[PDB]
Amino acid sequence: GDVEKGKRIFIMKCSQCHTVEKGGKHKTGPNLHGLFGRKTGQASGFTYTEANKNKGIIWGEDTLMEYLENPKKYIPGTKMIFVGIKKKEERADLIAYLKKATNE
Ligand code: HEC
Ligand SMILES: [Cl-]
Ligand SMILES: [Cl-]
């Protein structure tokens, strides 16, 4: 995906509730640093729903592609009230940005 396009998508659609940098603050949603390769519900210091803790998947490109299309379909009962991104290329670009930004 296109990291530069994905950053803009993140800012427009996600930054209201999320940070990505190491040591970044929790907002309505958790800081996302270290997301890839981690089970759901594991950001340090954030209180998740039981639903997000129970999901028991590992975040990576494929599981994010699915989640971000329709969050409540993937994790029923989640407190992330976000409609989703319908277009696959936009999800891919966002996820490429996340893969970079949450790993530095
Ligand atoms: C507020 C209105 C949000 C917006 C907009 C987005 N997210 Fe979110 N997210 C939010 C909350 C409250 C939570 C916790 C959910 C719970 O049920 O406890 C989350 C969670 C995520 C997760 C899962 C994190 C984990 O399991 O550690 C991810 C991967 C995530 N959010 C990503 C994300 C992205 C990329 C967004 C823009 C497209 C986005 N969220 C919007 C709140 C909100
Ligand atoms: Cl709960
Ligand atoms: Cl991956």
Swiss-Prot record:
Major place of residence: mitochondrion
A Pfam family the protein falls into: Cytochrom_C
Residues reported in the UniProt entry to bind heme c: 14, 17-18, 80
Modified residues (N6-acetyllysine): 72, 99
Residues found modified as N6-succinyllysine: 55, 72
PTM per Swiss-Prot/TrEMBL: Binds 1 heme c group covalently per subunit.
CC terms in the record's Gene Ontology section: cytosol; mitochondrial intermembrane space
Keywords assigned: Acetylation, Apoptosis, Electron transport, Heme, Iron, Metal-binding, Mitochondrion, Phosphoprotein, Respiratory chain, Transport
GO biological process: apoptotic process
Residues with the N-acetylglycine modification: 1
Location of the protein in the cell: Mitochondrion intermembrane space
Sequence positions bearing Phosphotyrosine: 48, 97
PANTHER family from the UniProt entry: CYTOCHROME C
Family that this chain belongs to: Belongs to the cytochrome c family.
Role played: Electron carrier protein. The oxidized form of the cytochrome c heme group can accept an electron from the heme group of the cytochrome c1 subunit of cytochrome reductase. Cytochrome c then transfers this electron to the cytochrome oxidase complex, the final protein carrier in the mitochondrial electron-transport chain.
Protein name in UniProt: Cytochrome c
Naturally occurring in which organism (per UniProt): Ateles sp.
Organism lineage string: Eukaryota, Metazoa, Chordata, Craniata, Vertebrata
